[model samples]
Target: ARGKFITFEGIDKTTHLQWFCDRLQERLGPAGRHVVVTREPGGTRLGETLREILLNQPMDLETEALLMFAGRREHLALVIEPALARGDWVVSDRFTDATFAYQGGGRGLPRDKLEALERWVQGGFQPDLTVLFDVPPQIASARRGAVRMPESESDAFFARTRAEYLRRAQEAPHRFVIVDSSEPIAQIRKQLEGVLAAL
Candidate 1:
């Protein structure tokens, strides 16, 4: 059987450092399944260069969205799909859900265009599971005070983004799960463990 794709998605308008994927790797490794931990927008070299431009400066909504999937297309072809082909489970930090939330909801990009890019880049193949770390914008802002998370976003921005994240999960309940970011790491890992065990 082909290996599974797991995406660790969060606005990081709040956070978790790396516990979920690391624990997942440790658990699954003994089962003889190789796991490669990777993140988006810069998985490949060219993608990294694009990532700098995307993150360092304010960008047009359309251009920002395009650069995202541009990295994603490279990410899929070079790393993600190949990992799955080799039966190595792939764990990514972010995936298409980000585009929908940030671009479609936060930046006010149209849904039709986002859907078009999604089809062109991903061709309907979605993550086997998307673990969305959801937090209240109020709480995220408080965290950001110490961490300055999402330098580009405000509390209002995350409000829209957070809402969209839940909306997407609701739309595809089978493909996504909501994790409370406020939970202790141990509790979070237990949930992730069960998800991987089922996989």
Candidate 2:
């Protein structure tokens, strides 16, 4: 059987993901499960090169989404699918939801195009679990303290992105766990523990 695939969504999950990875190793390592920690847009070599371009160079909205799917298609074929087929757990930092949020919501790209790309790239595949670290755009902006990209960091853009994420979670309640990222670290970890235990 293929192993469970878990993905973390929302903005700024670096610290929590690190902790989550360690905790996963602690819990599943003894059971012979290997946890593969990865991220979208940069999971593979080709993906990383695309990621750099995506971050640095501005392009048409459609072009941006297409490149995102390009990297994802490669990531699935080269890293995610192989690891899962080997019965190893895969923890991705972001997946298709990111495209829906950042591109579809923030950039106001149409949903149908993204849906078509999702089908073409991933078929019916979806993550077993998606932990969304929910927080207000202002809070995340304050945390960043630097402007990497004005379009992505704007409060309006983040608000729309966060709204899309919530909509997706509501549409698929079973696969999503919305966490109040504004909560204390210990508290968040406790919630994660419960979710992991249930999984």
Candidate 3:
């Protein structure tokens, strides 16, 4: 019995997850309310170590992608899979889609290669619900400031990733929910409340 896998995503929307998941956990209430909140790389103990390498160490394109999946595999096997099997909802700040956006869309890695890695590592497992927090560049800057990241801090790179995300959502509306970060916070949450209700 697999539980729901929900991922909240955006360059900056990582900030939205804590509050949203907390609210949703409280909202879900009582029965079947065992909730686990996690994020990639740091999702497992090994993954956390690898995350430090990813953030601080320098590596080639392929190595970077491989390290990401390596952490992902650990995360899936040790955390996500077990939790889901026990019927506890697992929420993440980001998922495989971020790999595509950062490595493929932003870093110029081939799409086919990333896709192949995803298939091999994740198999048919996909996020039960993925929420995309779309924000303007200016707004994105405000949410998270002065960060160290690969692929430089180019607007073009972020735009490319956003486009990739948009394309994916358009292709599979059933699996995705796009939230306009530019909208009023209250209004956005109201819409997200609707999303949670149906779930």
Candidate 4:
């Protein structure tokens, strides 16, 4: 029953989520442990639908933020909580922080509302570790390319989203391990190893 929960957070296109999964497999595979890796806004059937609406269709920022929470609520009830109860290690790509940053930071939503939504959805479940991929917004935007901005939205939205992520990371230093994403992949892997060791 010894299992751990970990999450990777960052703007879209950063390699933090990918690196976390690869390193986790490399380090933990020898034991033949059961680990679950998942991403936010689409961890379940219903979540997938919500994810498409949130990311692809392009709603207002507030609507997008609410949809994220709605999908997360379903994901927690159907996937994350059950896995934790079964003593399986769970690693998530994005979680509440995404909502906080995107909605609260990008769209100027109230912080208190975001906090309330998280508290209501989580119901005492929290990840044991959260790894934040720290990268410049410009770099991330360039990397994501066409996925995020499809010629309709301006770059200003992405810039605001990036600012929000940094602000939230600073606010919750204890819960986050900010890994510089500009570093080499090997170096970032080394940093992840340290995080895993400490965990």
Candidate 5:
């Protein structure tokens, strides 16, 4: 059987992915399954170069969206798919959901274009699980303790982004696990452990 693909989204500053990766390794390694941790927009060399440009340089909305998928196309071909094909689980930080939240909602790009890019880049593929670490913009701002990103997006910008994240979770309830960022760390991991066990 093929292995699982997992991705994380939403307020990620407080979440520690390495801990989850360690847990996955411990639980699954003895079962003879390999787990790989990777990230989007920089998984491959081409993707890394594009990530630099995407972060440092400003561009048109469509151009930004296209570049996001361009990197994703390479990421899947060179990294994500190949690992899964080997029956190794893949865990990624950020994926297409980030594009929809940041570009479509935060930047006010049209949704249809992103959907088109999604189809072109990923076809019908999606993460087997998406852990959304949801937190309100005000709380996230307070926790992060700095204006997020050099662009200095207002609370409203992140509010829109957050709404989009929740909307996606609602749309795909089966694949999405909404993590309340305000929860106690132990409680949060308890829930996560249960989730992984159930999965």
Candidate 6:
């Protein structure tokens, strides 16, 4: 059988990603399974260039969304699809869905445009599982402290982004698992472990 593809998604600076990656290794270790853990828009050289422009620079929503899809297309064509084809167990920190939530939902981009971007870029490559760390916008904003980027400075944006995440999770419950990230670290890890076990 082929290795499984697991993608972890959340707004940057949330501690849930750290817990998820750590627990993934710990829980899957006994089975002699290891994951090729990576993040999007920085996984490859071209993707990294796009990452800087997308996250750091202040661009309009439409421009940002287009750039996001551009980076995604490059990453999939170069890094992601190839790794999966080699039977590597892949774990990505963020993927196309993050773009949908941030650019489409938060920025109010058209749903059809976002859908077209995903379908065109991915060519139907979907993860076997997507773990979404559900955290309140205020909590996630507070966690950023001083290092928060310009795009993340607005509480309203985070709120919209989080709502989009929840909506997507609801729409694709089977593919996406929403874990409450406000709990203690230990409890969060246990829930993630359960998700992996059920997977």
Provide TM-scores for the models: 0.83, 0.88, 0.86, 0.79, 0.89, 0.79
| Backbone clash count for every predicted candidate, in the order shown | 0, 0, 0, 0, 0, 0
Residue-wise lDDT of candidate 6 within 152-188, one digit each (tens)?
A: 4587788888888888788876799877676577877
Candidate 1 per-residue C-alpha lDDT over 1-199 given as tens digits, one digit per residue, 9 for 90 to 100: 6778988777871244366666667777787778887887678898899989987988687888888889999999999999899888898888899889888878789889998999999897999998898875344435655553354468678788888888888999789878787666777777767776777
Residue-wise lDDT of candidate 2 within 56-163, one digit each (tens)?
A: 999998998889999999999999999999989999999999889988888899989989999999888989999999985344424567333434369888889889
Clashing pairs in 4: none
Q: Which one wins on lDDT?
A: 2
On lDDT, who's better, 1 or 3? 3
Alpha carbon lDDT at 175, candidate 2: 93
Give the runs in model 5 whose Cα sits over 4 Å from its true position: 13-15, 137-153
Clash-forming residue pairs, model 2 = none
Candidate 2 RMSD to the real structure: 5.2
For 126-194, candidate 5 gives per-residue lDDT tens digits of 899999998753444255664444225677788789888898889997799888876678877988898
RMSD of 1: 5.1
Worst 10 residues of 5 by lDDT: 141-150
Consecutive 10-residue window with the lowest summed lDDT within model 1: 140-149
TM-score of 3: 0.86
Residue-level lDDT tens digits of model 3 in 93-169: 88888888777777888988898999999898889999988765454434475433534479788888887777667
CA lDDT for candidate 1: 0.80
- Clash count, predicted structure 4: 0
* lDDT of residue 41 for candidate 4: 65
Better of 2 and 4 by lDDT: 2
Model 4: lowest-lDDT 10 consecutive positions: 145-154
